[PDB]
Design a protein around this ligand. Sequence first.
Ligand SMILES: Nc1nc2c(ncn2[C@@H]2O[C@H](COP(=O)(O)OP(=O)(O)O)[C@@H](O)[C@H]2O)c(=O)[nH]1
Length: 291
Amino acid sequence: ENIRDAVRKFLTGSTPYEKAVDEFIKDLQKSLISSDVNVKLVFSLTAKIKERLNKEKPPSVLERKEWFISIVYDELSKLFGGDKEPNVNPTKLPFIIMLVGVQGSGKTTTAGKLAYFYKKRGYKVGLVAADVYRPAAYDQLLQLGNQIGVQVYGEPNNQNPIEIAKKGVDIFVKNKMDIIIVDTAGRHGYGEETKLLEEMKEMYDVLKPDDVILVIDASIGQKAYDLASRFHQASPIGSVIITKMDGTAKGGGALSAVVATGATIKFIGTGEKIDELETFNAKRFVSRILG
Ligand SMILES: Nc1nc2c(ncn2[C@@H]2O[C@H](COP(=O)(O)OP(=O)(O)O)[C@@H](O)[C@H]2O)c(=O)[nH]1
């Protein structure tokens, strides 16, 4: 968002177009690089911009400055996810959504937010606490459920996440929930991403969820590429939610990195409150950062 005031500087006029453009371009590069966006993506973005500038003459009836900003808007939009806005509604009821992610990525919180998101859309939602590796997670999700009138199945003394998840899903299915959101986890520690993907697959093979969602903490910046890519390869149907887009400068890096894998981002988390979840739209994200 540091570019917001930079874009303002460019638009309000000051210096002749060509000099002002070049100055904006370098400022853009500085901001993106500072947001941990991958260097190749930054330079490729700039080159495509010049290529558009140096090939698309704006009609005379339009302000050059305005036109240049539109192109930047367009190209930034592609960097952060394109124009296709994902479908987040169930394809059938009941609809089982499975959440996976490393420790601390905001999974439990995101489970709560997703429940709220769907409840506001008129769905009956059930939450399943199947994270057996962090003990306090059941109670944490329970408090989230209590906050929004959504029931939470859990078994605090059971160390088999698959048995819990399966029983949780079965009980919500029998009681006719529309949407069932399972909060899962793999083992912490060495090879956390390997343990995560193996545990995800075992759970997937038993639940047969309709939707698998990797939860990624934005604070890891462009390092999100590795897990998003391994997840995308292991689960071509899977999508991503990026959390804490409000608690770091590296959110740009995370978002662009995930996008570069070809994985779909369905929602972003924008804070600690249970209502702070939005469907992801790249153009809307760019408007906010452009001003
Ligand atoms: N600022 C911000 N904080 C978040 C967001 N999502 C989660 N958190 C915080 O991240 C911490 C861990 O979240 P949690 O759901 O417990 O992660 P988990 O360990 O993967 O289940 C908590 O302190 C949350 O308040 C978000 O979108 N924005």
